[model samples]
Target: ARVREYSRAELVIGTLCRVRVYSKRPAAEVHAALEEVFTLLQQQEMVLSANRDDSALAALNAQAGSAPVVVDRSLYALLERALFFAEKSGGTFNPALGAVVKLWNVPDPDALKEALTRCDFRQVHLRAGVSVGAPHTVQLAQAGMQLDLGAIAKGFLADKIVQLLTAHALDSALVDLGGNIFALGLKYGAQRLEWNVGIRDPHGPALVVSVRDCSVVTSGAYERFFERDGVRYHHIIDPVTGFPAHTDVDSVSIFAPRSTDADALATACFVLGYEKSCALLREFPGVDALFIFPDKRVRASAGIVDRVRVLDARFVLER
Candidate 1:
C-alpha cells in the first residue's frame, strides 16, 4: 500500500487526535471530514462533553442536584450506553464517577464516603420512548452524582472516527485519541504497515504490541494521582472504595472490537488487580488484555497471545 498523503489534527479534548486514512481522495477532504466530527462536538447543543458549555451533558450537569433533566436523544442514548458499559464492567467503571474523581487530591475520607454514595450508576435513570418535553429523561436519585465520561468518551470518539472512515469508503485508517487507539486494516507506513501499537509504560523504555481491527486502551496508576505518606496512590479509583485502587498491577491494556468497551475494560481490569483481571478478561471473548505488574512480568489473555509481543528482555510474558 502506498500513502498518497498524511494529515493530523490537534484536539481541544486535552489529547492529540490523529487520523491516517487510506484513500485516493484529497488529503484535505479526509482531514476536513475528520475535523467535521470534532467541530460538531462543540457546535451540537445535544452532544455530551465537559469541554464546553454548549453540550447537552452540560445542561444535565447544571441540574445535577435538582430534578430529572430531559435531554435530546443524543444524551439520552449516551446515558443508555454508559449505563450498560458500567454494569458490564461489574461497576468498576462508571460515567457517574465524577462524584469521586474530584477528591483524589487532598482526600477527605468522610467526604469521599458521601461522594461515593452519590456515584452509584444505578441512581441515574433514563426514560425512553417519550416524544414530548425533551425526548428522553435522565434523573439522578442523589444530588451530587455527575456524569464524567473521561474513561469512555475518548474511545467513543475514536469509534466515531473509524465509522466516518468506513463510510467514506476508506478501508485502512489509524486513530489515536490519547492512549485510546483504534487500528483499521493494516499499517500504512514508509516501509510497510501492520496492526502495531504501543503499550504505555511509565517506566518508559517502551513495550510495543500488534493489534487487530480493534481499540487498544492502556490504563495505569501513573496517569493521575496525589501521593501521601510515602504511598503512591493512583487515580484509577474503585467505585466500591472511595480510595484509589491499590494493586500489584502497574498497568492494564485491553483490546476490543469496540473502542468504548476496550476503554472501560482497561480501567476495570486495572482496578480489578492481577488475578481477578485475568479471570474477568476471560468473560470477554472478543476482548484481550495485557497486565504489566510491578515486578516487570507480563500476563496477556489467551486471545492476544499471537498478536501481542514485548521488546524488552526485562519484561517476560507469563505462561
Candidate 2:
C-alpha cells in the first residue's frame, strides 16, 4: 500500500521549520497532530531563544552573577545536556558563547575581544530542584556571561517533536527545525526501506546516506556568514579565539539516536576537528559522523563509512 504523506511548514526559531509524516491515518488527524508540533515549536522557541529579551534563557541571563533563576524542568534538563557536552568537548561546545555571538553580530572587534573574556562555560552553574515539585535553577558566574542554546536547542526541540509525533500515533516522520533533522522511522513502501538523507555540501556537492529512527544534524560554515574585505566571518565561533572557528573542516553532519546529542555533537565535532572528533565519538557509543573539508575531501566515522555515498563526482569520500 502507498502511504500518504502529510506536512506542515512554519517560520519559527528564526528559520523555516517543516515537518512531514508518512502514515495511512486520516489527513485531518495528521494535520491536527502537526498543529500540536508547531505549538510545541513556538512554546519551546520562547523558552530557549536568546534573541528575545523576554525569553526564559534571557531571564536567566538577566540574573547572571546575582542569583540563580528558577527554570522549568525541561529547560533545566536541556541545560544539563548543554553543559554536559560543553565539558565533554572541553568547552568546544560552550553554551556561554552568547556574548561572542552577539559581538560578532555587531561585527565589533573591540567588543568581541572583551566579550570573549566572559564566554566561559565554566561560569554557568546549574542547581537541582529542592523538592519533587520545585523547579531547578540556572546561574551564570559573571555579570556579562550569557547562555546561548542556539547550537543545541534545535536538537532538543527535534527530539521533543519526535516524542510528540510518536504520542500522536505517527511513527514515520521527518522533523526539520532549521536544518536540524530527525528521520523517525522506515519509509516503508515496498522497495526502499530507510530514509535517504542528503548531507548538503557547504560548497556545492551532494552526499547521501540512509538512516532509520535517527537524527542527521549538520553544522556548516556556509549557513550564516558575512564577508568583510574578502574575509568571511561565519557564525560558528571558536570559544578560545572569540572568532569563527578556524579549522580545515567546512562542515560536519552527526548521526545519532538523539537529535539533542547529535545537534550539540555537530557543533562540537566541527570545532574538535576529525581526529579529536573521533576520540570524542568513542565517548558517545553508537554515534557516527561525516566531515566535509574545504579541500573537497569527505571523511566518515568508522560505523558510517560504508553507508556514506558521494553523490557528486567533485567530492571524494575518504575512509
Candidate 3:
C-alpha cells in the first residue's frame, strides 16, 4: 500500500512549527490531526511561554516575592521539570534567568547587577495541591526573580505534539518545534527504518544522524546574537555569571528519548562544553550528544557514533 504523507506548518510558539505524519490513515483524519496539533501548540504557548505578558508564567512572575500563584497542573508540572534540571545541571540549566535574559533585551551595569542577584533557581518554590486532583502553585522567593522556560518549553511542547499525534493513530510522525525534533515510530518504508535528521553546521555542511523514536535538539551560539564593537554576544546565558555563556563549542546537539530532556540538556551542554558536559551526562546515561567546536572538530557520545555521518570533509570527527 502507498502510504501518504500529511504535513502542515504554522507560526506559533515564536517559531515556525511543523508537523508531518506518514500513515495509511484516512486523509481527513490526518488533516484534522494536523490542525489539532497547531491549535494545541498555540493554546499551550499562552500557558508555558515566558515571552508573553498575558501568559500564565507572566502572572507568576508578576507576583514574584508575593503569594504562590495557582497554575494549571501542566504548567506546574513543567515548572517542576525545569527546576529538577536546574538542580541536576547545577544551575547550568537555570529556569529563573528571566531577569538576566531581560537585561540582555535591555542591558546596563547596575541593572545587570540586580538581574544577576535574582538569577538563582533556588528562588523558585513549588507547592503541591493539598489533596488529590487539587491545584498546584509556584512562587519566586525574591521580588525580582523570574522564570524563563524558553530553553525547555519547545521540547516539552514537541513531546505534547507527539502524544497528540500518537493519539490520532498516526503510524509515524516527525515534529519540528523550532528545531526541537522528535521522530516518532519508524520511517515508512519497505523495511524497518529511521528518520534522518541533519544538525546544521554554523559555518560548514550539516551533520546527519539516523535516529528513531527520539528527539534531536541543538543549542548554538549562532542561534541568536548581536555584534557589539566586533564582539559577538549570543543568547544562551550562564546563570553563574548572568551573561551570555563563554563557550568554545559552536553548537551542541543532544539525542534523548524525551524532547524535554534533550532540549534542556542541549542548552546545558552548550554552556558546559564537551569535557565538563561529559561529567554532567553521567547523570543521564540514556542521553547522547554531539559537540562541534569552533575549530571544526567534532565529538560525540560513545553510543551515537553509529548513528552519525559527517557530510563534509572539513569537519573532523574526533572518534
Candidate 4:
C-alpha cells in the first residue's frame, strides 16, 4: 500500500493536549480538521479542568457546599461517564478520589507521606454536579483535594480527533497524543495497508505486541511515580487507600473501538489486579488487552490472542 506522510502542529484545547495527525489527506484539509478538534478539546478542558481557575469545574470545587453549579453539556457528559465507570468498577476507578490523588503528590515524597492521612474519596460528593460533602468539610479538604484526569483525557481527545477527521472525509489517519493513540480506517493512501502499532512493555523493551486499526493505551505505576525509602510509588492510585495501587500486574494495554474505553479500562484493570482483570475482560465486549505482569509473564485476553500478534521477546503465542 502507498501512503502519504505530512507533519502538522495543532494547539490542543486550552494548551491541555496537542495532537499530531498522520494521514494521506492533503495538508490544508487535515489542518482544518485538526483545528476543529483542537477547538473541541479546548472547550472540553475548560469544562473539566479543575486546575483552571476560570473553569466550571474549579468554580464548583470552590463552592462545594453553597450550591450546585449547572454544568455544560460536555462537562455533564464526561461526568456521567466517569460516574458510571466509577460505580461499575465498585469505586476502583474513581474520580471522587480527588482528595486521595492530591495527597500522594507522587513527585514529592515528603509531602505525600505528610498528607497521606487526609486522602479519602468519601469526602468528595458527586450529584448533578461535583461537591465536597459535610463531615469532610469542603474548606478543610480544599487544601488536599484535587481532581486529576491525566489517566483518561488523552484517550478521550484521540476519539474526538478520529470523529473530526472522519467528518472531513479523511478515511485514513492516525492520531497520537503522548502515546494515547487511535487509527482511523486502515492505512493512509493504500487501501490494503494496515497500520502497525506496538504495545509498550513497561518493564522491558517497547512494542512487545503489534496490531492494526486499534486504540492502544497503557496505565502503569511505572508511568509516573517516585521512590521513597525501600518502596517504589507510582501513579495509578487506589481510591480506597488513597495511595498508588498495589497489584500483580505492572501495566495494562487495552485495544478498543473508542479511546475513552481503552483509557478507562486500562486503568481499571491495572487497579483490579490479575485474576479479577482477566475475569473483567471476559465481561466486556469489543475490547481486548495485554496484561504485563511484574514477573515478565505476559497474559493476553482471548480476544487479544485472536486479533493481535505478540512480538515482544518475552511473549509466545498460545494456540
What would the per-residue lDDT of candidate 4 be over residues 258-297, giving only the tens digit for each residue? 8888888889889999888777777677888887777667
Put down candidate 2 lDDT per residue, 1-319, tens digits, no spaces: 3579778999999899999889888888898899999999899878999999888888888887898788898998998999999999999999998888877774577777888888878878888867767768888988899889999999999999999999989889988988789999878665548888888879653899888999999998889989988999888988888888887788999999999999999999888887888899999989989998888899888887888888987899986
Predicted candidate 1 versus true structure: per-residue lDDT over 205-318, tens digit per residue: 357778658788889989776667888778788888877888778998888998878887788888888887877777778888888888888887777766766777788787
- Candidate 2 pairs with clashing backbones: none
Per-residue error (Å), model 4, residue 265: 1.2
- Poorest stretch of ten by lDDT in candidate 1: 40-49
lDDT of each: 0.75, 0.88, 0.88, 0.66
Encode model 3's per-residue lDDT on 1-319: one tens digit a residue.
5688778999999999998789888888899999899899989988888888998888889999998888888788788888889898888999999989987863777878888888778888899857878878888988888888999999899888888988999859989988889999888775768899998887534688899889999999888899898888899998777788998799999999999999999999888878889899999999999999888888888878788898887788888
Comparison by lDDT, 3 against 4, better one: 3
Q: Give the higher-TM-score candidate: 1 or 3.
A: 3
Report how far off residue 275 is in candidate 2 (Å). Answer: 1.9
| Backbone clashes in model 2 | 0
Model 2, position 269, has a per-residue lDDT of 87
Supply candidate 3's per-residue lDDT for 229: 86
State TM-scores per candidate.
Answer: 0.89, 0.95, 0.97, 0.80
Residue-level lDDT for 316 in candidate 2: 96
